[PDB]
Amino acid sequence: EKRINKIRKKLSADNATKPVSRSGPMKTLLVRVMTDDLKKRLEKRRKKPEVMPQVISNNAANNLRMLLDDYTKMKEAILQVYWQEFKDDHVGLMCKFAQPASXXXXXXXXXXXXXXXXXXXXXXXXXXXXXXXXXXXXXXXXXXXXXXXXXXXXXXXXXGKFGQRALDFYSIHVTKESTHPVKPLAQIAGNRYASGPVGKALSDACMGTIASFLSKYQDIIIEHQKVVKGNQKRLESLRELAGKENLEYPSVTLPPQPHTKEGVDAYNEVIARVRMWVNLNLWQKLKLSRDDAKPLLRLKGFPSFPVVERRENEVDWWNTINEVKKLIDAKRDMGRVFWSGVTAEKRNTILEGYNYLPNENDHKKRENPKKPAKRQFGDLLLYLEKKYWGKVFDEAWERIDKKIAGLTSHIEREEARNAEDAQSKAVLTDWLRAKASFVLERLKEMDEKEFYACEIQLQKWYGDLRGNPFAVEAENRVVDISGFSIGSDGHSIQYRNLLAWKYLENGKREFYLLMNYGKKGRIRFTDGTDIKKSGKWQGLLYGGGKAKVIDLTFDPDDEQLIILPLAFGTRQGREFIWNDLLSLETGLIKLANGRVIEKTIYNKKIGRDEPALFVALTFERREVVDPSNIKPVNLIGVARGENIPAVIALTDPEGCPLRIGEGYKEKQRAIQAAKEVEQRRAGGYSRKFASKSRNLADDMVRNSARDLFYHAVTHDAVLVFANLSRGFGRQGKRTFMTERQYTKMEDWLTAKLAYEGLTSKTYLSKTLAQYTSKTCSNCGXXXXXXXXXXXXXXXXXXXXXXXXXXXXXXXXXXXXXXXXXXXXXXXXXXXXXXXXXXXXXXXXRFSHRPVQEQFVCLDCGHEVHAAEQAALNIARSWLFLNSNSTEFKSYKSGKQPFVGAWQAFYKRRLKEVWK
């Protein structure tokens, strides 16, 4: 009773249905094309198929290569010419992509006392439902709608929404007229692809991409205007250094608002220089806390123009290896006169301060730990200093040169045979960096002028040599299928693609995808109804608004007609090809769009270089359940977290009364530990678990969304989430992006709720997260007053005591926190409390949740899991918000804050009906 398709057949089989209004919910297939290895997978089994289905016929693959390669070339040409348009005039291209308005009317005016940003910002009281005042500027009425007031209500020059079809791309490059000199269908594709579907799909893709770039660029220009205003407001760093008299000058002026991309680089360079100076001379040598001298923020978020502005820094491995060896062996003789020279004492400071000699690598936890190869050279230097300082350099150089020669001979004999050693490359780079950072100490002692030039060259070479043998080339290749429609004259296929389903022997089908992107016809159709055991080839082409299957006649020929046999499960087909509730060939689902994707999938037998072929037909729904349900006895309190996500508590409607996805952080910590142990040695990543964590996270999100949806439906309940303010994450030091999923569960639950009809007003509600997980379920904050008296505060709720136990660690520490309290209390206590952060002791002992699972109250003496207790607080916080009893009249009139009003609701209802 706990599968997902049982719940959708519980929803869609107890109340009525209704058609959609304008658009619908979208799903997508992701079927794979049966090339050859999908048939090798079939002739390897125990039971074997009756009909060994089909294979890509070795000519369809060649024209797919031609089509995808021509498509990406045309995309790069269009994006390069609009990049050259964008670098010449920002606001011109922004005004080009604005939109048309609609089919409006004779709206209002605001010419006087209202201009623009970059020319007659009019107005209209559009929707009279609950929100009007749409500005919608003109002179093509560009729907400008902005002005966030604050200091000046200035409306945005370009519109509130950049658009896809604003430019009329099919009046430019693709048409035979219009002497714009860049024509992709003519110059690049060689005039052999049809200028119908190719030009319009390429239009849709390129214009959607530049619309997304401009729609990000406008907001980023606005937010960098705010950040540069705040950063000009934060040059009291010059005020403090004169205020403390200890520092002379930073000597740096800020540029204006950058606006290009390289201005952002110069601006953030100056910001980094000032920030490094502030950390070096104010945060450390003068011991100032961060939140007294606020630092300069960095301009982050500036987008780049999409495809053309990528890096492509590709270099070959052995040539850079020989370059590092050339730089090392050039300066060998100058290193000999240096290390045989100056002192014993200064040279010991070089050997000890620059991390050569091993500090504590002897802690043998059942063999020593390994050394980072700048310290193995230190051990060899120590042994040669004992046994043998001029000729120590020669023996050290010969030994490390023999190690280097053995490593490069092993990599040459293993790389150029069949495979990649994949770890000894990293060790060769580490030992080369060690030889470099041993040779360079003439320059790090004599003159630091040219020392930094060779250092940044060696840093670039080391970064190349460690990262570039693990970089992935060969990004995905997509072509689009923009719609399935019969033309105006009812005998044609506009966009020239179909879902075929040639009939097999008994009753089953084959389900090809037919593409005809050449400059010809080659597909025709009338109608049919027979079911004979041959190529009925039917089709589903969506005539007008109606859905119609056809009888289709064509011959497989090597000029056009990409014929892709699909491969999918019974699950995907049962879901949205032949679903017995939402059938095709009736119109309850309709196909909308399609692709063809050549992406790199992982094949286990070799490395990941196995590009497969997926299709991805995307579908829109047209039959939708009408909301006439209530969910009264409901209040399922979804309380989310990173350790255990989605903790569940179910109540009654008055408020009186599961750990979905329990073991989850351990699994991703194990995957992360595998990535980290494969990253330290063997400097890259080993591209096998390059999608393991995303697949685990997706499986958890979708299984937990299934479980939340199940417990919502079968117990006649409404889920109650907390307003986590999307984008919510811990965002610290050891905080991986794979456990930031407080938004993803809500997104997937809405996506399974938007599909199959419903909205976020019948099974999903959201309440405020203020002071949940903090109030005990039989008791009542964050204003822990330490103003009460050093021996023992008595608090508000009755009386307390002292005698603590603070377990502060991150080293080797623990405390009883009373003797230290008396030591920090001095005597007169006022001077103590002025000069103590010893409130941290009380806030570490007397706090709720000492360990980050449990909970301890301060007047109940109660122990709860603080996740079931958080869930009950969520399910009662929503019951407090929209129930006007007495106390929600307060906090809307502004009488009390939220805390006292919620406590007065809670302890009144805790004695009344225990809620």
Partner DNA sequence: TATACTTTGATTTTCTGCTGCAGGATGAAATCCCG
Partner DNA sequence: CGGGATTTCATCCTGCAGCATCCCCGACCCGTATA
Partner RNA sequence: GGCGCGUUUAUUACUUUGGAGCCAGUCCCAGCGACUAUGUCGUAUGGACGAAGCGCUUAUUUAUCGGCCGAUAAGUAAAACGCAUCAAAGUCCUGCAGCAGAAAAUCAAA
User: Scanning residues 204 to 223, which ones bind DNA (CB under 7 A)?
Assistant: 204, 208, 211-212, 215-216
Per CB under 7 A, the segment of 232-240, 341-349, 457-465, 481-489 that binds RNA is 457-465
**Pick from 857, 822, 826, 854: nearest CA to 841:** 822
> Measured over all CA atoms, what is the biggest interatomic distance in the chain, rounded to whole angstroms?
101
Amino acid occupying residue 488: S
Q: Does 413 bind RNA (CB under 7 A)?
A: yes
Smallest distance, RNA to C-beta of residue 811, A: 12
Report the residue number, 698 or 859, with the smaller CB distance to RNA: 698
Report the residue number, 379 or 859, with the smaller CB distance to RNA: 379
Smallest distance, DNA to C-beta of residue 762, A: 15
Hey, which bits of 221-290 come out as E strands? none
Residues 675-704 binding RNA (CB under 7 A) are: 675-676, 679-683, 685, 688, 691-692, 695-696, 698-699, 702-703
Q: Does 769 bind DNA (CB under 7 A)?
A: yes
Amino acid occupying residue 482: S
Q: Which of 19, 49, 100, 653 binds DNA (CB under 7 A)?
A: 100
C-alpha 381/C-alpha 392 separation (Å) is 8
Q: Which of 528, 535, 587, 684 binds DNA (CB under 7 A)?
A: 684
Q: Which of 403, 711, 744, 876 binds DNA (CB under 7 A)?
A: 744
Residues 470-499 binding RNA (CB under 7 A) are: 475-476, 478
Distance of CA 529 to the CA centre of its chain: 49
What is the secondary structure of 307-330 as a DSSP string?
Answer: TTT-------HHHHHHHHHHHHHH
Q: Which of 524, 574, 715, 895 binds RNA (CB under 7 A)?
A: 574
Residues 603-622 binding RNA (CB under 7 A) are: 604-605, 614, 616, 618
Residues 785-844 binding RNA (CB under 7 A) are: none
Burial of 873 (0-12, 13-18, 19+ CB in 10 A): buried
Residue 489 contacts which entry, RNA, DNA, none (Cβ below 5-8 A, type-dependent): DNA
Q: Are 561 and 480 in contact (CB under 8 A)?
A: no
Amino acid occupying residue 371: K
Q: Does 843 bind DNA (CB under 7 A)?
A: yes
**Pick from 319, 311, 317, 327: nearest CA to 458:** 327
C-alpha 18/C-alpha 759 separation (Å) is 14
C-alpha 447/C-alpha 445 separation (Å) is 6
C-alpha 467/C-alpha 429 separation (Å) is 11
Residue 662 contacts which entry, RNA, DNA, none (Cβ below 5-8 A, type-dependent): none
Report the residue number, 168 or 219, with the smaller CB distance to RNA: 219
Q: Does 66 bind RNA (CB under 7 A)?
A: no
Residue 293: count of CB within 10 angstroms of its CB = 17
Dihedrals phi, psi of 477, to nearest 5 degrees: -125, 125
Listed in sequence order, the residues at least 6 apart from 242 whose beta carbon sits closer than 8 Å to its beta carbon are: none
Positive or negative torsion for Cα 807, 810, 813, 818? negative
Residue 761 contacts which entry, RNA, DNA, none (Cβ below 5-8 A, type-dependent): none
Listed in sequence order, the residues at least 6 apart from 517 whose beta carbon sits closer than 8 Å to its beta carbon are: 67, 193, 194, 197, 198, 479, 496, 560, 562
Burial of 911 (0-12, 13-18, 19+ CB in 10 A): exposed
Residues 67-126 binding RNA (CB under 7 A) are: none
Angle of the 665-680 helix axis to the 692-714 helix axis, nearest 10: 170
Residue 575 contacts which entry, RNA, DNA, none (Cβ below 5-8 A, type-dependent): RNA
Smallest distance, DNA to C-beta of residue 166, A: 8
Q: Does 290 bind RNA (CB under 7 A)?
A: no
Q: Which of 728, 755, 846, 888 binds DNA (CB under 7 A)?
A: 728
Residues 708-747 binding RNA (CB under 7 A) are: 729, 731-737
Burial of 274 (0-12, 13-18, 19+ CB in 10 A): buried
Burial of 27 (0-12, 13-18, 19+ CB in 10 A): middle
Element (H, E) at 385: helix 376-387
Report the residue number, 338 or 495, with the smaller CB distance to DNA: 495
Q: Does 4 bind RNA (CB under 7 A)?
A: yes
Q: Which of 433, 621, 631, 909 binds RNA (CB under 7 A)?
A: 433
Q: Does 573 bind RNA (CB under 7 A)?
A: yes
Q: Which of 691, 714, 885, 886 binds DNA (CB under 7 A)?
A: 691
Q: Does 325 bind RNA (CB under 7 A)?
A: no
Q: Does 170 bind DNA (CB under 7 A)?
A: yes
> Which pair of structure tokens corresponds to residue 678?
């494969």
Place of tokens 């103003």: 787
Element (H, E) at 455: helix 451-467
C-alpha 574/C-alpha 579 separation (Å) is 5
> Which pair of structure tokens corresponds to residue 330?
């050039």
Q: Does 22 bind DNA (CB under 7 A)?
A: yes
Residue 865 contacts which entry, RNA, DNA, none (Cβ below 5-8 A, type-dependent): none
Q: Does 705 bind DNA (CB under 7 A)?
A: no
Q: Which of 492, 686, 762, 890 binds DNA (CB under 7 A)?
A: 492
Smallest distance, RNA to C-beta of residue 674, A: 7
Residue 444 contacts which entry, DNA, RNA, none (Cβ below 5-8 A, type-dependent): RNA
Q: Does 40 bind RNA (CB under 7 A)?
A: no
Report the residue number, 193 or 511, with the smaller CB distance to RNA: 511
> Which pair of structure tokens corresponds to residue 206?
């390129």
Virtual CA dihedral for 667, 669, 671, 676, nearest 10 degrees? -170
Residue 413 contacts which entry, DNA, RNA, none (Cβ below 5-8 A, type-dependent): RNA
Size of the site for RNA (CB under 7 A): 154
Smallest distance, RNA to C-beta of residue 818, A: 25
Q: Does 174 bind DNA (CB under 7 A)?
A: yes
Q: Could you say which DSSP state residue 846 is in?
A: S
Residues 50-89 binding DNA (CB under 7 A) are: none
Q: Does 560 bind DNA (CB under 7 A)?
A: no
Smallest distance, DNA to C-beta of residue 258, A: 15
Residue 310 contacts which entry, RNA, DNA, none (Cβ below 5-8 A, type-dependent): RNA
Number of residues assigned to the chain:
915
Q: Does 737 bind DNA (CB under 7 A)?
A: yes
> Which pair of structure tokens corresponds to residue 766?
């959201």
CA atoms in the 13 A half-sphere facing the CB of 326: 8
Smallest distance, DNA to C-beta of residue 511, A: 19
Smallest distance, DNA to C-beta of residue 357, A: 7
Q: Does 304 bind DNA (CB under 7 A)?
A: no
Q: Are 189 and 195 in contact (CB under 8 A)?
A: no
Report the residue number, 335 or 780, with the smaller CB distance to DNA: 780
Report the residue number, 564 or 874, with the smaller CB distance to RNA: 564
C-alpha 532/C-alpha 525 separation (Å) is 17
Dihedrals phi, psi of 183, to nearest 5 degrees: -130, 100
Q: Does 462 bind DNA (CB under 7 A)?
A: yes
Place of tokens 């009425």: 141
Per CB under 7 A, the segment of 129-137, 195-203, 572-580, 806-814 that binds RNA is 572-580
Q: Does 834 bind DNA (CB under 7 A)?
A: no
Residues 181-200 binding DNA (CB under 7 A) are: 194-196, 200
Q: Which of 226, 402, 460, 892 binds RNA (CB under 7 A)?
A: 402
Q: Are strands 26-28 and 617-621 parallel, antiparallel or unpaired?
A: antiparallel
Q: Which of 170, 317, 542, 602 binds RNA (CB under 7 A)?
A: 602
Residues 139-198 binding RNA (CB under 7 A) are: none
Q: Does 756 bind DNA (CB under 7 A)?
A: no
Q: Does 168 bind DNA (CB under 7 A)?
A: yes
